[PDB]
Amino acid sequence: SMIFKPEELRQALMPTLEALYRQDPESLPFRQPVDPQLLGIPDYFDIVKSPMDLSTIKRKLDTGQYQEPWQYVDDIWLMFNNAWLYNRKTSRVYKYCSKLSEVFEQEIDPVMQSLG
Numbered sequence: 001s002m003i004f005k006p007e008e009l010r011q012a013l014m015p016t017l018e019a020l021y022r023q024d025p026e027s028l029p030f031r032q033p034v035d036p037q038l039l040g041i042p043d044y045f046d047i048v049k050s051p052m053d054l055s056t057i058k059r060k061l062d063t064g065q066y067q068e069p070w071q072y073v074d075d076i077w078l079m080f081n082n083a084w085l086y087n088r089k090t091s092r093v094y095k096y097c098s099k100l101s102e103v104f105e106q107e108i109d110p111v112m113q114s115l116g
């Protein structure tokens, strides 16, 4: 595959991450790691083996931890798939996840075309 530099990935991908943060209120559950003790859900880490959230993805982009853009896409989908796995289909967090995923699909498609 092609080489990607960290600054190039920030320019291309940060707008797609920003679009998720700007979904308000729907991004609020995703702006920080899940805290199962605080949120009253002690089985969370038994169900969700690889936690992920927007702050972690932002830090990885900011510090240059992605070598290529599909690693970023993988982390976004990990975050979404964790929330659809743990939460019931009628719950607020599940519905907010679906909203963010719709926004992401719209934003990421032209960006990955340009990168690829």
Ligand SMILES: CCc1c(C(=O)N[C@H]2c3cc(Cl)ccc3CC[C@@H]2O)[nH]c(C)c1C(C)=O
Binding pocket: 028, 029, 030, 032, 033, 034, 035, 038, 039, 041, 044, 082, 083, 086, 087, 093
């Ligand atoms: C239902 C639990 C849950 C939340 C969640 O409730 N987040 C809330 C939160 C959590 C912490 Cl630690 C600190 C602050 C805030 C502010 C509000 C924000 O909605 N987020 C997710 C992805 C889930 C689950 C189980 O997938």
Ligand SMILES: CCc1c(C(=O)N[C@H]2c3cc(Cl)ccc3CC[C@@H]2O)[nH]c(C)c1C(C)=O
Binding pocket: 025, 028, 029, 038, 039
């Ligand atoms: C959707 C964002 C939001 C939440 C919210 O996500 N609460 C979560 C939470 C957060 C903490 Cl830190 C502690 C406990 C709990 C349990 C419930 C739930 O998991 N509560 C409110 C008032 C809002 C909004 C937008 O007014």
